From Swiss-Prot, chain A:
The RNAP catalytic core consists of 2 alpha, 1 beta, 1 beta' and 1 omega subunit. When a sigma factor is associated with the core the holoenzyme is formed, which can initiate transcription. This is DNA-directed RNA polymerase subunit omega. The gene is rpoZ. It holds the Pfam family RNA_pol_Rpb6. It comes from Escherichia coli O45:K1 (strain S88 / ExPEC). It catalyses: RNA(n) + a ribonucleoside 5'-triphosphate = RNA(n+1) + diphosphate.
UniProtKB/Swiss-Prot annotation, chain C:
Coiled coil: none annotated. This is DNA-directed RNA polymerase subunit beta'. Signal peptide: none annotated. Belongs to the RNA polymerase beta' chain family. DNA-dependent RNA polymerase catalyzes the transcription of DNA into RNA using the four ribonucleoside triphosphates as substrates. The chain holds residues 403 to 453 of 1407 of the full protein. The gene is rpoC.
Curated annotation (Swiss-Prot), chain E:
It comes from the Bacteria. This is DNA-directed RNA polymerase subunit beta. Belongs to the RNA polymerase beta chain family. Coiled coil: none annotated. The RNAP catalytic core consists of 2 alpha, 1 beta, 1 beta' and 1 omega subunit. When a sigma factor is associated with the core the holoenzyme is formed, which can initiate transcription. DNA-dependent RNA polymerase catalyzes the transcription of DNA into RNA using the four ribonucleoside triphosphates as substrates.
UniProtKB/Swiss-Prot annotation, chain H:
DNA-dependent RNA polymerase catalyzes the transcription of DNA into RNA using the four ribonucleoside triphosphates as substrates. Homodimer. The RNAP catalytic core consists of 2 alpha, 1 beta, 1 beta' and 1 omega subunit. When a sigma factor is associated with the core the holoenzyme is formed, which can initiate transcription. GO terms for cellular component: cytoplasm; DNA-directed RNA polymerase complex. This is DNA-directed RNA polymerase subunit alpha. Its EC number is 2.7.7.6.
Length: 79, 50, 51, 231, 100, 50, 50, 224
C-alpha cells in the first residue's frame, strides 16, 4: 500500500508528470484488461499504478512504446 | 418510456395515479411521537383521527 | 436498509481512496489536505493532531 | 527462585451489605499491583448482574407523560427504576409486578414477592402516590447481562413486535460501583518481601464478594489461554 | 445545582417565569406531576373566596430551540409554603436555583 | 477560605491529590488537580452539525 | 502543546532523581528501568548510545 | 451468555529476528488489551526468572573507577559489556566462570572457560579489547540465578565489582492496543505485543512463560 509517494517522484522527476503517468496507467488497469505488473496486494488501481512507477516498470516512455506496440499488433489485424 | 411501457406490458403491474408525498422522520432522528395535532379547514370533513 | 454487507462493501470502496478535508477560512493551501479515511463510529471527523 | 508463593483468598471482611474488603495473600513482590489492577479492570467492566430493562405502566403510552396521582413524571419513574438493585437466582429474565394504591411512597418493597428474585434495597423509592384513590400498576422486566446496553443500541433487536406502551430503560448491568486495592506487607514465614492485596469492593449488593473475585480471576485465566498456548 | 454558585441563581430562576412561584402562602393541599393545589392561609385570602390556588404545571412543551420546557413539582404533599416560594422547578432549575 | 474548607472536609489543602492511571494501575508522577467543575452541555450538538 | 510538554518533561534532568549515576547498556535498559520503577525519567545516567 | 467472552482468533506472530517478535492478538474484549498487555508487561519485566552476571572479580582492579593498562576501555565499560552477557545455566543455582586471555584483539565471550552446565548464547559478544600482548586479563565472573532486575545499588569485600543484574531474559516489551471490529462491534481491542529477549529464550516462549506464571498465580480462585 501507499502512505508517501516520494520514491515514485524520483523516477518521474516531477509530481505533476507522476500524477499524469499514474492516472494513465490506472485507467489502463481499471477500464481495460491490462493486469498489474506488480502483485496486486488488495490495492486500488491508483496505488498499483504508483507501485509500478516506483519500481521503474512504468513511465511515460514505457507506456508510449506499449501503446505503439499493441496498437500496431491490433490494427494490423487486417483480414 | 418505451422500455417502461414494455416492462409494464410484461408484468401487468400498472402505474399508480397518486404519488407518495408522505411525511417521514428525518434521517438519523429517532424518537417518540408524543403529540399529534390536526387542523382542518372548515368545510373539509374530518377523518376518524381528527 | 443499511444491511450488514454494505458495511463490508463500504470498507472496500474507501480503501485507498483519499478525501479532502477543508477548514474555513482557507487562508493558505494547507487549509485543504487529503487524508486516507478510517471509518469510525461517531459523528465527528477525527483529525490527526499534528495537522 | 523459580517457584512463586501463590495467593489465596484469606479474609472477606463485610463492612456493609454493599461494601467489602477481600484479602489475597500471600503475593510475591511485584504481583500485588499486577493482580490488583488486572482484577480491578475486570471487576469494574465485566461482572454480570441483573438490571431493569423494560417497564409497562398501565395508563401510560410513553415516558414523556404524567399519570394522575403520581407525583413524578413517567420519565422520573423510569430513572428511579434504572437504579433498582435486584438479584435473580436461576433465571436470566423475570417480569416483576408492582401494584400499589393510596397515598404514600411506592418503594421497591411493594414489588410482588417472587421466589427466586430478591430485592436488595427494599426502601428504594420508586414513586409517590399523592391521591387516596390513586393506583399504579406496572410490570418491571429485569434481565441478566453484562456491561451497559443503552436502549438505543437495543431497539435494533427485532423481537416479533414491540407494543406501544413498553418503555425501554437503559440497562446498567454491572453490580460493582467502585474498586480500590491496596498492597501491604504480609507477616508470612519470616519472609519479608511477600505482600498482600486488599481489594476493597463497593457494589450495589447484588453480587457476593468472593463470587466476584472468583469470576474476575476466572475471566482473566481463561483469557490467558491464548497466551499460554500461543499458536 | 452548582456546588459553587455566586448567589444570583435564585434570582435568575425566579425572575424568569420558568418556575411556578406561590402567589399566596399556604399549605399544599394536593400535589401531582401536573398541578399543585395550595390551600391558602386564612391570613392572605379575601372574604368571599374559595381560598385555593391551583398551579397548572407545563409538561413537555417545545422551546424555540426545540428543547423541552417541563415543570416538576418541587413541593411535597401537606407542606407549608409561603408567598414567593418556588413550587415547581422549570427547565434547568433545581429547588428554585438556576442549574444549567 | 477555600483551603480552610478543604481542611474541614479532610482533603489536601493544595487541591491536588495523587491519581493512578486506570489502564496500567501505576501512579502519575505528580499530584493532579482534582475537583468538581460545573460543566455545561451547549446547544452545538454533533447530531445537528453532521 | 501536549506533545512538546511530554517531550520536554521526558528530556529534563532532576538532581537526585531515583536511579542516578548508574551505567546503562543502551536505550532499552533505560526503558526497562523506567517501566520497572527503578529509575526516574530524569535520572542523570551514563548510557551506551550507538 | 454473560460469562462467555471474545477470545483471540487471529494470533499473528512476526519474527523480526530470532530474538525479536511481534505478537498480535485480535479481537479482545473492550479493555482487555490493556488488562492482558500490562499484566504480561509487568511479569515479563520484573518477575520472570533467568540468570545473569552479578559480580566480577578482576585481579588488578580494586573498584569500579580504577584503571588497568592493556585494555583499551575502562573497567566501567568492561562491566557494561559483562552485564549484557547472556547465559544459560542448567544444573546450578550459582556458578563462577573464569576468563583468562592474553594476546591482541577482542576478549570475546568465546574465551570463557568452557563449563558443562553453562552455555553462553552469543560467543561473539565482545567483553574488552587487549592491545599489548603482554597484558592479560584474569577475571572471575559470578553468574547467579534470580528474577527480574536488581540494580547494583540495591545490593550494596574489596576487589568485587557489582554488576547490575538483568536476570529476566527480556530486553524490551512494548504493547499497543489498537481498535478492532467483529460484526460491526467496532469497540473491540487488538493487542500488539512487541518483545525482544536477550537470546536465552525465544520471544513467544517468553510470552508463554509469563502467561503461565500469571495463570498459576490465579489457580487458587479459578472455577472450572
Amino acid at each position: 500500500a501507499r502512505v508517501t509517494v516520494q520514491d515514485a517522484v524520483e523516477k518521474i522527476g516531477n509530481r505533476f508528470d507522476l500524477v499524469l503517468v499514474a492516472a494513465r496507467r490506472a485507467r489502463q488497469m481499471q477500464v481495460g484488461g491490462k493486469d498489474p505488473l506488480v502483485p496486486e496486494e488488495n490495492d486500488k488501481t491508483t496505488v498499483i499504478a504508483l507501485r509500478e512507477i516506483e519500481e521503474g516498470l512504468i513511465n511515460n516512455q514505457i507506456l508510449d512504446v506499449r501503446e505503439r506496440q499493441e496498437q500496431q499488433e491490433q490494427e494490423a489485424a487486417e483480414l | 418510456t418505451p422500455e417502461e411501457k414494455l416492462l409494464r406490458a410484461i408484468f401487468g403491474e400498472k402505474a399508480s395515479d397518486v404519488k407518495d408525498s408522505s411525511l417521514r422522520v428525518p434521517n438519523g432522528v429517532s424518537g417518540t411521537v408524543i403529540d399529534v395535532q390536526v387542523f382542518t379547514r372548515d368545510g373539509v370533513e374530518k377523518d376518524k383521527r381528527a | 436498509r443499511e444491511e450488514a454487507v454494505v458495511w463490508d462493501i463500504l470498507d472496500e470502496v474507501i480503501r485507498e481512496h483519499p478525501v479532502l478535508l477543508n477548514r474555513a477560512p482557507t487562508l493558505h493551501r494547507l487549509g485543504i489536505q487529503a487524508f486516507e479515511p478510517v471509518l469510525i463510529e461517531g459523528k465527528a471527523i477525527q483529525l490527526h493532531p499534528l495537522v | 527462585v523459580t517457584e512463586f508463593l501463590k495467593p489465596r483468598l484469606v479474609d472477606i471482611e463485610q463492612v456493609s451489605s454493599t461494601h467489602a474488603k477481600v484479602t489475597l495473600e500471600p503475593l510475591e513482590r511485584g504481583f500485588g499491583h499486577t493482580l490488583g489492577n488486572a482484577l480491578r479492570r475486570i471487576l469494574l467492566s465485566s461482572m454480570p448482574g441483573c438490571a431493569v430493562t423494560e417497564v409497562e405502566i398501565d395508563g401510560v403510552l410513553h415516558e414523556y407523560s404524567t399519570k394522575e396521582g403520581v407525583q413524578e413524571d413517567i420519565l422520573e419513574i423510569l430513572l428511579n427504576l434504572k437504579g433498582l438493585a435486584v438479584r435473580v437466582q436461576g433465571k436470566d429474565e423475570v417480569i416483576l409486578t408492582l401494584n400499589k394504591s393510596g397515598i404514600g411512597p411506592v418503594t421497591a418493597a411493594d414489588i410482588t414477592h417472587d421466589g427466586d428474585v430478591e430485592i436488595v434495597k427494599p426502601q428504594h423509592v420508586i414513586c409517590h402516590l399523592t391521591d387516596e384513590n390513586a393506583s399504579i400498576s406496572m410490570r418491571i422486566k429485569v434481565q441478566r447481562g453484562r456491561g451497559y446496553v443503552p436502549a438505543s443500541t437495543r431497539i435494533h433487536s427485532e423481537e416479533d413486535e414491540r407494543p406501544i406502551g413498553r418503555l425501554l430503560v437503559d440497562a446498567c448491568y454491572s453490580p460493582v460501583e467502585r474498586i480500590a486495592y491496596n498492597v501491604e506487607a504480609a507477616r508470612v514465614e519470616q519472609r519479608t518481601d511477600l505482600d498482600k492485596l486488599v481489594i476493597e469492593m463497593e457494589t450495589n449488593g447484588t453480587i457476593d464478594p468472593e463470587e466476584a473475585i472468583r469470576r474476575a480471576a476466572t475471566i482473566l485465566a481463561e483469557q490467558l489461554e491464548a497466551f499460554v498456548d500461543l499458536r | 445545582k452548582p456546588l459553587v454558585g455566586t448567589g444570583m441563581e435564585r434570582a435568575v430562576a425566579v425572575d424568569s417565569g420558568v418556575t411556578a412561584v406561590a402567589k399566596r402562602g399556604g399549605v399544599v393541599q394536593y400535589v401531582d406531576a401536573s398541578r399543585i393545589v395550595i390551600k391558602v392561609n386564612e391570613d392572605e385570602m379575601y372574604p368571599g373566596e374559595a381560598g385555593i390556588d391551583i398551579y397548572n404545571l407545563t409538561k413537555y412543551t417545545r422551546s424555540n430551540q426545540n428543547t423541552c420546557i417541563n415543570q416538576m413539582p418541587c413541593v411535597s404533599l401537606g407542606e407549608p409554603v409561603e408567598r414567593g416560594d418556588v413550587l415547581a422547578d422549570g427547565p434547568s432549575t433545581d429547588l428554585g436555583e438556576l442549574a444549567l | 477560605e477555600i483551603k480552610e474548607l478543604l481542611k474541614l472536609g479532610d482533603l489536601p489543602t493544595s487541591g491536588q491529590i495523587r491519581l493512578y492511571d486506570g489502564r496500567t494501575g501505576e501512579q502519575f508522577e505528580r499530584p493532579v488537580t482534582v475537583g468538581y467543575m460545573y460543566m455545561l452541555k451547549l446547544n452545538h450538538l454533533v447530531d445537528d452539525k453532521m | 502543546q501536549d506533545v512538546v510538554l511530554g517531550l520536554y518533561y521526558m528530556t529534563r534532568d532532576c538532581v537526585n532523581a531515583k536511579g542516578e549515576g548508574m551505567v546503562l547498556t543502551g536505550p532499552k535498559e533505560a526503558e526497562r528501568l523506567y517501566r520497572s520503577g527503578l529509575a526516574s525519567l530524569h535520572a542523570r545516567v551514563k548510557v551506551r548510545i550507538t
